[model samples]
Target: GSGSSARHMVMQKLLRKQESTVMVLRNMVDPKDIDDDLEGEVTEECGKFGAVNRVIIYQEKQGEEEDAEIIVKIFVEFSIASETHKAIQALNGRWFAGRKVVAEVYDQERFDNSDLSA
Candidate 1:
């Protein structure tokens, strides 16, 4: 069975659209390892600086092969702007789980309309 593709404008409108609300975390190890404990660890660590609204973990294939590896991407959203700033200053260029993680404010800027087409 195929899932239906529907656009909910009202739902989209309800989401907070702030640039500093989201933090893009990259270069984390094995996506399979991101279980409850790992998420708890992330929440606990990030919580020290500020309150986080939600965390998003996404996996992308490193290579276009059958046996490609997983690369995990984490997006941490804060309840407020100052908390995100605090997190960016503390977590940026820091090592996590044997990998040097990179954190930055998620920028939503694109002059081109390529993403709309996709």
Candidate 2:
């Protein structure tokens, strides 16, 4: 899971946007943790700064060979423009390969699910 720095930047970025977007903050942490429970809190705080559709907390995926790690994903949706697509392109195929954490945002659409948050 990613740390707070990434969340802070995302919050900081959307605080200035004019559009109402949902900021889904996903992190790999125990849901029992106090901080993990605070994802909703951040979503509420972000709402004050802008429109937040929702904030989702995904549980860590676990396996025998590779232990499952819970992490947060921050999803913000706005008007998809050329610039926005470019930005996505820039981050496409890129991943946050941290020392102990790993993350990636695919540029291609693998599947469509309107109820992804549920």
Candidate 3:
């Protein structure tokens, strides 16, 4: 199987309801390049789809591995599910700095609980 298929399989297990208003995007940028400017840019772009409640770029903790996927992930919470869906549709598979963005609905409870662990 291709690497893409493996990723899709993992996504399937973590998939949430379509009505969820929170979304997570991966591969938007390298973890080392994360900064306030990038967070602002993501907030602005996601705002185009809906009223964004929050945007969080996961950062590597002092003891965490720098290359962990969670370090480069971004969480965006929208005010409504429709807009979240719209954003996922528009952003998924799109290219950013030569990386294909992977957008998926995030677990509302985890997000609300501030759980960013993989």
Candidate 4:
């Protein structure tokens, strides 16, 4: 009984860990693809799997040297972790703003621990 109880608690913790607030998107077509209004659209798009609580965008050059692509990054928070997982599945290798962008699930725990401000 004690072992089962401990196992149950671990499972519960993992289930709760399903919620995430970070995502990494690469290969942007344009730096301006995700603006304020566009951010709302992205939030709505991310909502298909679950409720979008917040969304953040980061734009920077992929490289410092000449003619480097200006990559666009997106970070979003979903109401549920399951929804975040679903969104990640649907978004990877999908086309956005006329470009095929790759989507990866950002580590929320690591992001939270680090002081990387958007």
Write the residue-wise lDDT of candidate 2 on 13-78 in tens digits.
Answer: 566743223222334333445474465764564444444444444453444346555344444342
RMSD per model, one decimal: 13.5, 15.6, 10.9, 4.6
Model 4 spans > 4 angstroms off: 1-21, 32-36, 63-69, 113-118
Question: What TM-score would each prediction reach against the true structure?
Answer: 0.63, 0.35, 0.73, 0.65
What is the lDDT, from 0 to 100, of the residue 77 in candidate 1?
70
lDDT of 3: 0.82
Tell me the tens digit of each residue's lDDT in model 4 across 6-73.
76676675555345556666664377444557677788777777888777666666578788866667
Model-by-model lDDT, in order?
0.68, 0.41, 0.82, 0.69
Query: If both were scored by lDDT, which would come out higher, candidate 1 or candidate 4?
Result: 4
lDDT of 3 by residue, 1-118 (tens): 5698766686776766546689999778876666668878999989889999989888645465665443477889999999999999999999977899999899888888888764
Residues 42-107 of candidate 1: C-alpha lDDT, one tens digit per residue = 777789878877775667677799889877777777778788888888888999668887877774
- Model 3 off-target regions past 4 Å? 1-18, 60-70
State the local distance difference test value for candidate 4: 0.69
lDDT of 1: 0.68
Candidate 1 residue pairs that clash? none
